[PDB]
Design an enzyme around this catalytic site. Structure first.
Site, PDB file in Angstrom:
ATOM      1  N   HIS A 113      -7.335   2.108  -5.918  1.00 56.30           N
ATOM      2  CA  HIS A 113      -6.274   2.417  -4.628  1.00 56.30           C
ATOM      3  C   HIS A 113      -5.230   1.545  -5.449  1.00 56.30           C
ATOM      4  O   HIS A 113      -4.039   2.304  -6.300  1.00 56.30           O
ATOM      5  CB  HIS A 113      -6.361   2.374  -3.218  1.00 56.30           C
ATOM      6  CG  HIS A 113      -4.951   2.592  -2.523  1.00 56.30           C
ATOM      7  ND1 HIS A 113      -4.965   3.312  -1.928  1.00 56.30           N
ATOM      8  CD2 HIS A 113      -3.880   1.701  -2.128  1.00 56.30           C
ATOM      9  CE1 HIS A 113      -3.534   3.257  -1.117  1.00 56.30           C
ATOM     10  NE2 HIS A 113      -3.190   1.814  -1.495  1.00 56.30           N
ATOM     11  N   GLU A 114      -5.364  -0.072  -5.549  1.00 58.21           N
ATOM     12  CA  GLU A 114      -4.183  -0.169  -5.825  1.00 58.21           C
ATOM     13  C   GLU A 114      -3.599  -0.525  -7.532  1.00 58.21           C
ATOM     14  O   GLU A 114      -2.622  -0.504  -7.799  1.00 58.21           O
ATOM     15  CB  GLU A 114      -4.487  -2.039  -5.925  1.00 58.21           C
ATOM     16  CG  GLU A 114      -5.037  -2.377  -4.539  1.00 58.21           C
ATOM     17  CD  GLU A 114      -3.994  -2.066  -3.842  1.00 58.21           C
ATOM     18  OE1 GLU A 114      -4.013  -1.927  -1.987  1.00 58.21           O
ATOM     19  OE2 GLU A 114      -2.788  -2.512  -4.006  1.00 58.21           O
ATOM     20  N   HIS A 117      -0.970   2.290  -7.632  1.00 59.04           N
ATOM     21  CA  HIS A 117       0.356   1.736  -7.621  1.00 59.04           C
ATOM     22  C   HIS A 117       0.731   0.674  -8.542  1.00 59.04           C
ATOM     23  O   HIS A 117       1.706   1.263  -8.611  1.00 59.04           O
ATOM     24  CB  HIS A 117       0.154   0.055  -6.263  1.00 59.04           C
ATOM     25  CG  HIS A 117       0.198   1.248  -5.136  1.00 59.04           C
ATOM     26  ND1 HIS A 117       0.688   1.987  -4.758  1.00 59.04           N
ATOM     27  CD2 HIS A 117      -0.508   0.278  -3.582  1.00 59.04           C
ATOM     28  CE1 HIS A 117       0.368   2.711  -3.432  1.00 59.04           C
ATOM     29  NE2 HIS A 117      -0.085   1.210  -2.942  1.00 59.04           N
ATOM     30  N   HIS A 123       1.992   6.483  -1.773  1.00 62.87           N
ATOM     31  CA  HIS A 123       0.720   6.912  -0.633  1.00 62.87           C
ATOM     32  C   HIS A 123       1.024   7.904  -1.217  1.00 62.87           C
ATOM     33  O   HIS A 123       1.225   8.698  -0.637  1.00 62.87           O
ATOM     34  CB  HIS A 123       1.118   5.682   0.416  1.00 62.87           C
ATOM     35  CG  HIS A 123       0.729   4.807  -0.032  1.00 62.87           C
ATOM     36  ND1 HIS A 123       0.642   3.059   1.536  1.00 62.87           N
ATOM     37  CD2 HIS A 123      -0.255   4.535  -0.206  1.00 62.87           C
ATOM     38  CE1 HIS A 123       0.507   2.517   0.919  1.00 62.87           C
ATOM     39  NE2 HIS A 123      -0.565   2.528  -0.207  1.00 62.87           N
TER      40      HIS A 123
END
Ligand SMILES: O=NC(=O)CN(CCO)S(=O)(=O)c1ccc(F)cc1
Ligand SMILES: [Ca+2]
Ligand SMILES: [Ca+2]
Ligand SMILES: [Ca+2]
Ligand SMILES: [Zn+2]
Ligand SMILES: [Zn+2]
Length: 158
Positions: A113-114, A117, A123
């Protein structure tokens, strides 16, 4: 939004959480990068010295950016979009208990997930997406990006 304008990307692990074996931190992070290189033209290399595109940091509370951590629970990690300096960097809250499994907070899943980014993804509203704002353990051994994650990253790369 910003994207990396090159295919060879470096990362460096600034420091290691005492929650895990060192080799397990390395492997979790490597696997998380592989998730994204699987579906883009990007190539990721771990460097041990110098300036990396993506610096991976474990820290607690206030740690030198405008994004203080909040103790155990709540915010688990945060990361900055592509750019110079702190751009791309991924920070993990040391007040969590990082693991390789379903206990504590799974480093690999959080890192997928990070790194999303770090590559320029925001998101998703889709609960099935790794980019959904809420952490939930899923079996790491059979983990796959959602259709939404793949369309998101392929809107930016490849
Ligand atoms: O990237 N950081 C965030 O999106 C902040 N979070 C809060 C939203 O509840 S999280 O730390 O819960 C978080 C971190 C990683 C995940 F995979 C899921 C949730
Ligand atoms: Ca926290
Ligand atoms: Ca950086
Ligand atoms: Ca910890
Ligand atoms: Zn931070
Ligand atoms: Zn997030």
């Amino acid at each position: 939004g910003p994207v990396w304008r090159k295919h060879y990307i470096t990362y460096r692990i600034n420091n290691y959480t005492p929650d895990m074996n060192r080799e397990d931190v390395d492997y979790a992070i490597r696997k998380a990068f592989q998730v994204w290189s699987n579906v883009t033209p990007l190539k990721f290399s771990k460097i041990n010295t110098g300036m990396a595109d993506i610096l991976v940091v474990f820290a607690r509370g206030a740690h030198g950016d405008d994004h203080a951590f909040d103790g155990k629970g709540g915010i688990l990690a945060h990361a900055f979009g592509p750019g110079s300096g702190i751009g791309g960097d991924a920070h993990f809250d040391e007040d969590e208990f990082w693991t390789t499994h379903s206990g504590g907070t799974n480093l690999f899943l959080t890192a997928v997930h990070e790194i999303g980014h770090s590559l320029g993804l925001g998101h998703s509203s889709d609960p099935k997406a790794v980019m959904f704002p809420t952490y939930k353990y899923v079996d790491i051994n059979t983990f796959r990006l959602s259709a939404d994650d793949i369309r998101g990253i392929q809107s930016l790369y490849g």
